[PDB]
Structures are given as structure tokens and as C-alpha cells.
């Protein structure tokens, strides 16, 4: 049931105990805490308690990932949420890509969350269904969709097809339950995301029941926006959002 491979260098989770306002940061599918670490460190330096977990099956080897289900990834996030609940009076959740999906999923089940910051969150990726139809156990992963080519992202070099099915099911369930969300939402979307169609931001904006919601368009980033040129804006605007709603 446990992972068989060791944690990769750079994929370690990050925890910081600071003040009574906490932020949970969720990384994406086949990715690792590396993609959220600059945000986590900035929020900790700003005085927030921070939890950046490593999703089960992630940051080790794709064979470990293949053995996981979306319920395992949800459990990692629920565990991090619980860690914060034991420490903080106010909790925000943010996440990139499937991490954004999991942010939404958590908010659909926990009304106490005080705000969410999904970044290129995925609730519908038609290419997954199209990809089947018309095969192999592991697909060659695409290179990281980053506008800045100097940035090194840590993600598995192969993607298990079994795991894509798990992602599809997670997305469908998350999409179906969007109207349960009423907390404030700051929805970031890269205009030029080549992985998650940017209309996802509008599915989310229209689907949630929140009265305080906005879409912020990132014009200088591709999918992996947390490591891309718009990173400072994501951090600054997120910090403003946390302060306003705490």
C-alpha cells in the first residue's frame, strides 16, 4: 500500500508553523511540491502557517503513482487540511492544475475554508477522453508547459494511463459539485495554457455559488504558472486575498 520508491530530491513536503492563518498548497498531477514551493516560502515569510504536502504516489516514481487512486490524492490533501485545522483559526487553500481541482474538491466538502485560489485548475480536459478511443501502460510525458525555458520543473517522465482515468473521475466529481462552494474565490488562469483549456476558469467561475469571486488572467505564463514569469503577481495578489478574507 505504501510507496516503493524513495522521495526524489526537491520533492519533499514543506511545513511552517507561524500565525493563526494557514494556507494549504496543492501541487499537480505527476508533479511535486517543487511547483508550489516558491509560493509556500513566500507565504511563510509573510507570517502564514503553511502546509505543502506531497501527494501520495508523487515525487517518487510513476510506478508508485500507478498504484494510487484519486482517493489517495484526496487523502493527502485532507491530511494537510487536518494538519492546519489543528493549528489555525482561518484556512485558505490554493493549488495548481490538479492541485486546483483538489482545492475545489476540498472546498466542496469543507464549508469552513475561508477562501480558495485555484491556478489553472482542471475540471474538464476533453483531450483525456479523446486520447483513449480511436492503449499503452505508460505514456511519454509532455515537457513542462512553461513560457520561461530556464525553469526546471520536477515531474514524472512517464504518465500511467491508469492514473489519467483517476484524474478524469476526480475532475468529473469535482465539476458536478461546484455549486457547493460559497467561499471567496480568486481564480487564476493563463491565457496561453497549452494543457488545461482556459475555459476551465469560466466553468469554475459560473459553477461555484460564491458571491465573492473573480478571474485573474495571466498573460505572461503557460500552464505551470507558479514557476513562470507571472509568479510574483500570483504571490502578491494571493497575499492580498488572504489578508482581506482572514
From Swiss-Prot:
Residues engaged in binding substrate: 29, 98
Residues forming coiled coils: none
Keyword DNA damage: no
pH dependence: Optimum pH is 6-8.
Matching Gene3D superfamilies: alpha/beta hydrolase (3.40.50.1820)
Activity regulation description: Not inhibited by cholate, but slightly inhibited by triton X-100 and deoxycholate. Completely inhibited by PMSF (phenylmethylsulfonyl fluoride) at a concentration of 200 uM.
Superkingdom: Bacteria
Active-site residues from the entry: 97 (nucleophile), 193 (charge relay system), 223 (charge relay system)
EC number annotated for this UniProt entry: 3.1.1.23
Residues annotated as site: Important for substrate specificity: 142
Keyword line: Hydrolase, Serine esterase
Keyword Hydrolase among record annotations: yes
Record's catalysed reaction(s): Hydrolyzes glycerol monoesters of long-chain fatty acids
Other noteworthy facts: This lipase is not secreted extracellularly as other bacterial lipases.
Family affiliation: Belongs to the lipase/esterase LIP3/BchO family.
Quaternary state and interactors: Monomer.
Protein known as: Thermostable monoacylglycerol lipase
Amino acid at each position: 500500500m505504501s510507496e516503493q520508491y524513495p522521495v526524489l530530491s526537491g520533492a519533499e513536503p514543506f511545513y511552517a508553523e507561524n500565525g493563526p492563518v494557514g494556507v494549504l498548497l496543492v501541487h499537480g498531477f505527476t508533479g511535486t511540491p517543487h511547483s508550489m514551493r516558491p509560493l509556500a516560502e513566500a507565504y511563510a515569510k509573510a507570517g502564514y502557517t503553511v502546509c505543502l504536502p506531497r501527494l501520495k504516489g508523487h515525487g517518487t516514481h510513476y510506478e508508485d503513482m500507478e498504484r494510487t487512486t484519486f482517493h489517495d490524492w484526496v487523502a493527502s490533501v485532507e491530511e494537510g487540511y487536518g494538519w492546519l485545522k489543528q493549528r489555525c483559526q482561518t484556512i485558505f487553500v490554493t493549488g495548481l492544475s490538479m492541485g486546483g481541482t483538489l482545492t475545489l474538491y476540498l472546498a466542496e466538502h469543507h464549508p469552513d475554508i475561508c477562501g480558495i485560489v485555484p491556478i489553472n485548475a482542471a475540471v474538464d480536459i476533453p483531450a483525456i477522453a479523446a486520447g483513449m478511443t480511436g492503449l499503452p501502460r505508460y505514456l511519454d510525458s509532455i515537457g513542462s508547459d512553461l513560457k520561461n525555458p530556464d525553469v526546471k520543473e520536477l515531474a514524472y517522465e512517464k504518465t500511467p494511463t491508469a492514473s489519467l482515468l483517476q484524474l478524469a473521475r476526480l475532475m468529473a466529481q469535482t465539476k458536478a459539485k461546484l455549486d457547493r462552494i460559497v467561499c471567496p474565490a480568486l481564480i487564476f488562469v493563463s491565457d496561453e495554457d497549452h494543457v488545461v483549456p482556459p475555459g476551465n476558469a469560466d466553468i469554475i467561475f459560473q459553477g461555484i455559488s460564491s458571491t465573492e469571486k473573480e478571474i485573474v488572467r495571466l498573460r505572461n505564463s503557460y500552464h505551470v504558472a507558479t514557476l513562470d514569469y507571472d509568479q510574483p503577481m500570483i504571490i502578491e495578489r494571493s497575499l492580498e486575498f488572504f489578508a482581506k478574507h482572514a
